[PDB]
Amino acid sequence: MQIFVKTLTGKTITLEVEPSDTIENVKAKIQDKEGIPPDQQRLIFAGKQLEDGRTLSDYNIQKESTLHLVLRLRGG
Template identity: 55%
Template sequence: MIDLLLCYENANLATIAKTSNGKFPDEFATDQTIIDYLRPTRLRAYVEIEENRQKIQEHNLKKLEEDTAFQVFIKTLTNKTIIIIVTREDTVENITAKIHEKTDIPPNQQRIIYGGKQLREGLTLADYDIGKDATLRLIVNLPGGYY
């Protein structure tokens, strides 16, 4: 915070800016206004605020993109297509649970394939770089069967 002191010296008015802790006084020329004095400081602060605001907006946009729900297609061996809504943070367990809700196939009997690889429990769609409108393959294991 800046306190302003007005000093009269030989009928000339001098303005002194003094910080709230009393240190580092700066003198103004008599024709300089407070706004002129503060303008460079305000400009630097404004630029810094705008840079920080932009970084926050970019972070929030990235976070929004990560959390945004999208659809993926689940293709069965009988060529039936199931659509589920997911996020990149959904785990394989979440996917099998969503498939179970739509098909009544228990999660422990489901194998999900993407890009020729079986998806492993504990990993997320982001781990496999699975995004919007991807097609996953569903293979059903019958009880007592091998895979």
């Protein structure tokens, strides 16, 4: 599965994942691609916050979906 992760500003990151992969795995892959530590990442789909324990298939996230990424505002 190919999924997309977009911050509110507009940067888009394409990730290669399986529906079995957990949200912790997705944040880890985002850290590999963008260098953002997982504890500074908040992932949202369909207006709900995605918990690290569950996987992508648990949240009905299929191929070509976009997740919304919220980041810690260290610079306000």
